[PDB]
Design a protein around this ligand. Structure first.
Ligand SMILES: Cc1cc2nc3c(=O)[nH]c(=O)nc-3n(C[C@H](O)[C@H](O)[C@H](O)COP(=O)(O)OP(=O)(O)OC[C@H]3O[C@@H](n4cnc5c(N)ncnc54)[C@H](O)[C@@H]3O)c2cc1C
Ligand SMILES: [Mg+2]
Length: 514
């Protein structure tokens, strides 16, 4: 069973990889662990699961795809995106070369034959010259180590392991642990149904207003005259969105003018307020504060209890604004004004122990019928090192990254020839719009395989020195910004792609080709 490339993952990256490599004449197979395509949208069927990337933006720029597809709303839910991947599948004939239910579990490089020997958990083995890993950001849920967690008598699941058959909150006492992006969404749905909802917060999220909007086929057809421009523009912005920042400095502009821009951005919604402000919002602490202070007053107005507002929207920010990828929200702050909703600050009242009747903080037991763990996911290193990958260096990938992620171009790792990862560590990833990085990173991969086909090279390996230099470039770029003040994603897709494309133009410097 020999192939030019075996792709693991049937999200945007892997779907894109399968389509383009096939088009380029590579014998290719895709192994996806779940039963259907969609990536995160296969696994995340919890109530309220929605994109943070608005329409045109969170889809492929293939003309035959967006010509004949329309969305029901500006930010579609998980089930609508599954419909989008099914439509993509019919149009591009993908699934014939996908094999579902194959979880890749171990792999080993065969230097004599410059090909990978890949093993799934069902025992199937397959040779592939190239090992293209598209496992995403969210393939390893993080469940904290609370004493007695497995003891809980009611229903509990991680948001990334929501039952495929559904589950209702109606009339139940539900507790949600974590206020990440999935927590905000879960909190929104349970707040209208649950007999009581307690939310456990370590740190207040700085949730931005979504500005959701229902959509109609008519207006979308008229807009689609602008779509080719939108898809060109999104390749050229910091995070791959169609959001142009304001080039001025927040500090070099009159205050009434800052409030004007902040109000405009606030009304367009989404990541406009994250990424569309002034140029020094994420390089200058003073400028950063102007945008936090505007969000704080917006939010504190929505909340009726000042003791709550200090917890949800503190006067001092817990970190710099916009340093982590923001969560969106529709009515998340209003839910806390309800009489059936409570907010527990795990900093003040830490969780002592999980018990069958519920969650016991330092100031009492919170009896629950269902316990939702919205505690997020391991870093992208946990989803790649979850496969047992044996490199030509004598160690596993898990072992190679125990001190931290080590890559060149965010694409490869010394000791691991003919292996490339998309949306991997030290690439834009978390700071990027998925389909935008899938397309731009994707073309980089295809070009790389074509270059080796054209030049009779059967082997590529990042060098230890290029690995070292790459880390120094990340630290120097991120050292010019506030991002290291977060609790790594390469900041800047154009800066990123420019380095990648230029290494390729010098015949893949930093790699050894054989
Ligand atoms: C709820 C939620 C909403 C999000 N919304 C957005 C958004 O709006 N915009 C955005 O840019 N990003 C979003 N993200 C982050 C998201 O991970 C990336 O955006 C992106 O879409 C990742 O796409 P992907 O192709 O890289 O992989 P994913 O879509 O993450 O999928 C990876 C696939 O790999 C498969 N796989 C994993 N391990 C194995 C294995 N060992 N063997 C075989 N197969 C395996 C998995 O089953 C999974 O389907 C969101 C994440 C979550 C959790
Ligand atoms: Mg060899």
């Amino acid at each position: 069973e020999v192939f030019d490339a075996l792709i693991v993952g049937a999200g945007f990256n892997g779907i894109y990889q399968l389509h383009r490599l096939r088009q380029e004449g590579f014998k290719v197979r895709l192994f996806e662990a779940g039963a259907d395509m969609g990536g995160i949208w296969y696994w995340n069927c919890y109530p309220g699961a929605r994109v943070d990337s608005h329409i045109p933006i969170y889809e492929f720029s293939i003309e035959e795809l967006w010509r004949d597809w329309n969305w029901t709303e500006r930010f579609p839910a998980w089930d609508e995106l599954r419909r989008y991947f099914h439509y993509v599948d019919k149009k591009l004939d993908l699934s014939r070369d996908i094999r579902f239910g194959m979880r890749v579990s171990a792999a080993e490089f065969d230097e004599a034959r410059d090909q990978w020997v890949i093993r799934t958990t069902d025992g199937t083995v397959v040779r592939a010259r190239f090992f293209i890993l598209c496992t995403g950001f969210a393939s390893k849920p993080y469940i904290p180590n609370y004493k007695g967690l497995e003891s809980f008598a009611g229903e509990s699941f991680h948001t990334g392991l929501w039952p495929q058959e559904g589950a209702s909150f109606t009339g139940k006492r539900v507790g949600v642990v974590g206020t990440g992006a999935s927590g905000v969404q879960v909190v929104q749905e349970a707040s209208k149904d649950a007999a009581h909802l307690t939310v456990f917060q370590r740190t207040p999220i700085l949730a931005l207003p979504m500005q959701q909007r229902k959509l109609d086929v008519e207006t979308q057809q008229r807009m689609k005259a602008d779509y080719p421009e939108i898809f060109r523009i999104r390749r050229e912005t910091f995070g791959g969105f169609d959001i142009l920042r304001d080039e001025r400095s927040a500090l070099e502009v009159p205050p009434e003018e800052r409030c004007a821009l902040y109000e405009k951005l606030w009304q367009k919604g989404g990541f406009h307020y994250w990424i569309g402000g002034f140029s020094d919002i994420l390089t200058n602490e003073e400028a950063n504060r102007t945008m936090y202070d505007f969000w704080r007053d917006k939010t504190r107005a929505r909340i009726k209890n000042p003791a709550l507002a200090d917890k949800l929207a503190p006067m001092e920010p817990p970190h710099p604004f916009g340093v982590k990828r923001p969560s969106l929200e529709q009515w998340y702050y209003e839910a806390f004004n309800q009489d059936n909703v409570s907010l527990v600050d795990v900093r003040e009242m830490p969780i002592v122990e999980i018990v069958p009747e519920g969650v016991l903080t330092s100031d009492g037991l919170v009896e629950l019928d269902m316990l939702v763990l919205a505690t997020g996911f391991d870093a992208v290193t946990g989803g790649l090192t979850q496969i047992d990958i044996h490199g030509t260096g004598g160690i596993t990938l898990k072992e190679k990254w125990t001190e931290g992620a080590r890559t060149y171009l965010g694409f490869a790792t010394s000791g691991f020839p003919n292996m490339l990862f998309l949306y991997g560590p030290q690439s834009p990833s978390g700071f990027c719009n998925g389909p935008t990085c899938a397309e731009m990173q994707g073309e980089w991969v295809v070009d790389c395989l074509k270059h080796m086909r054209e030049n009779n090279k059967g082997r590529i390996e990042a060098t230890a020195q290029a690995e070292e230099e790459w880390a120094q470039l990340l630290n120097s770029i991120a050292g010019m910004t506030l991002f290291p003040r977060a609790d790594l994603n390469f900041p800047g897709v154009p800066i990123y792609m420019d380095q990648c494309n230029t290494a390729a133009a010098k015949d893949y410097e930093g790699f050894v080709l054989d």
